[PDB]
Structure formats: C-alpha cells, structure tokens
Design a protein around this ligand. Structure first.
Ligand SMILES: *c1cc(-c2cc3c(cc4n3C(=S)N(CCCN3CCOCC3)C4=O)s2)cc([N+](=O)[O-])c1
Lengths: 142, 140
C-alpha cells in the first residue's frame, strides 16, 4: 500500500502522497506521484499531534480545572497542552483520564518514606508502633 | 513566523529558498527535494533500523541492543518508527541509574512485614514492618 508515510489519494487509489507533518493540515492532496501535499500549518490555537492527513487541526483543550489543575506547557501546533500538577500537590489519576491534584500530605506523624511525587502522595510508615494507615498514623482499633 | 521554511519543511542545502517536507519517521532522505512542489524522496528504513520522527536525515539510526548488563529484556521489537524498547523481567523494579543507565533490582517478597504497595515496572514493593520501629533511613 502507500509505504511509510504516504497515504492513499482519495481521488485515485494509485497515487500515494506524503502524510502531513505535526502541526500542519492537509490543504490539499498531492496531484499525482512525485508531487508535494499541501500542508499548511495550524492556525493557533490548535495542533495536530502526529503524521496525519487531517482536514483540520484539533483545537486546544484547556485543563479540567475543576480538578485543581494547571497546565504547564502550552498548546502549540504539535503539542496539545500538558496539564500537570500545581506547585507540589499530587497527580491523582482518578480514573484516568480524568485526574486531580490532591494536596501533598505530609505524614500524620510517622516517619517519611517516599517523598511526595507526581504519581504518588508522600508515603508513610509510622512513629511509636502506631497502626499504619496510608498517611495517618492511627494507634489501633483505637 | 519568526521561522525560516515553515512547519514541516527543511531548507535545501542548495537553493536556499527551496524548502522541502521532512522525511517521516520510518524513513530517510533518499535524495533532497527538486523544487517546491514535488515531495522529498524518502525511502523506508532498512530492517533493524529506525529513525526519530521529523528527519531530514541521511541515514537511519541502527536499532538498539538491550543491556543484559542490567537485567533487561527487549520488551518490544525495534521497528522503523520506534526503537527496541527494553525493561526488567516480571517483576523486578527498574532503577534509573541516571535516566539512561538503569538497573534491574528485584521486587521485595514483602520485606520486613506485609505488602503495602504492590511492586511494578517503575518501583519496588513497599511494605510495612510487623514490628513497628519507625523508618530509620531504610530498615525498620
Ligand atoms: C531518530 C533520529 C535521530 C538523530 C540522528 C542524529 C541526531 C543528531 C545527530 N545525529 C547524527 S547521525 N549526527 C551526525 C554527526 C554529524 N557531525 C559530523 C562531524 O562534524 C560535525 C557534525 C548528529 O549530530 S538525531 C535520533 C533519534 N533519537 O531519538 O535520538 C531518533
């Protein structure tokens, strides 16, 4: 079929044009072998992520800010925005692909194991033989 | 805009206002492009070879070899538009000794107590001591 990186001409299923590039749409399909495809760039704010032959770019998506989000590199012809987590809170994907930043919990009096990190909250184990509970250090059933 | 050629094109080595589309990933520069309305010529990459992405690039890069010098296996084929990817066998956890060097290290059969965090591709198990001391550094 069209080898790597070429697609099938709709009009004539015997001609294979280059696929566009990230960032650009197809303004029109290349006229016959040998010929370039008209890839005109994305009107900001929009993108396409990849090889494609798309008649339009996909708009920028803003962050689902209900989840205490902030994006942290902007949407820009290849890149849809990346949102990620606000000044050292943590990225709880629930379920992906929504997620929220909960706040980073410092331990509820235990000894720090893992420090707070983009996939996981700080991780605790505890002071003075308390019964261990995620963050919390709760003595026992009480 | 602030640019030279636009998005998707390189400038010709020669006519410094020919621009040409870039070779796709999977494919190299067979020869640069004649003039502004014919495609650049891109041939597939040879087997056991691949290339980034947007290349105006003379050669493919050769595949990669997984380092058994750190407990790896190719977890997926190297094929033209993606490298050989490797990893640790199921399940060791993987330790990026500098993001680029990385090791295979085993999961813990729950050491010191019982299983908290199951262990996986990135990271080890985390357990908790059935004998509550209080993490001095790394023991109980
Ligand atoms: C896909 C494609 C690539 C790339 C290949 C190269 C990159 C940077 C350089 N290469 C090569 S092959 N190369 C040759 C050095 C040229 N010099 C000769 C002596 O005089 C000075 C110039 C580079 O400089 S990127 C890479 C990847 N990848 O993801 O790394 C994938």
């Amino acid at each position: 079929v069209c080898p790597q990186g070429k697609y099938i001409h709709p009009q004539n299923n015997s001609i294979c044009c280059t696929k566009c590039h990230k960032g650009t749409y197809l303004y029109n399909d290349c006229p016959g072998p040998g010929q370039d495809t008209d890839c005109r760039e994305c009107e900001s704010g929009s993108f396409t992520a990849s090889e494609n032959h798309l008649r339009h770019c996909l708009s920028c998506s803003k962050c689902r800010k209900e989840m205490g989000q902030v994006e942290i590199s902007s949407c820009t012809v290849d890149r849809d925005t990346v949102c990620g987590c606000r000044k050292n809170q943590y990225r709880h994907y629930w379920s992906e692909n929504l997620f929220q930043c909960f706040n980073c919990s410092l331990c509820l009096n235990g000894t720090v194991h893992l420090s707070c990190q983009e996939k996981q909250n700080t991780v605790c184990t505890c002071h003075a033989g308390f019964f261990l509970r995620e963050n919390e250090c709760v003595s026992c059933s009480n």
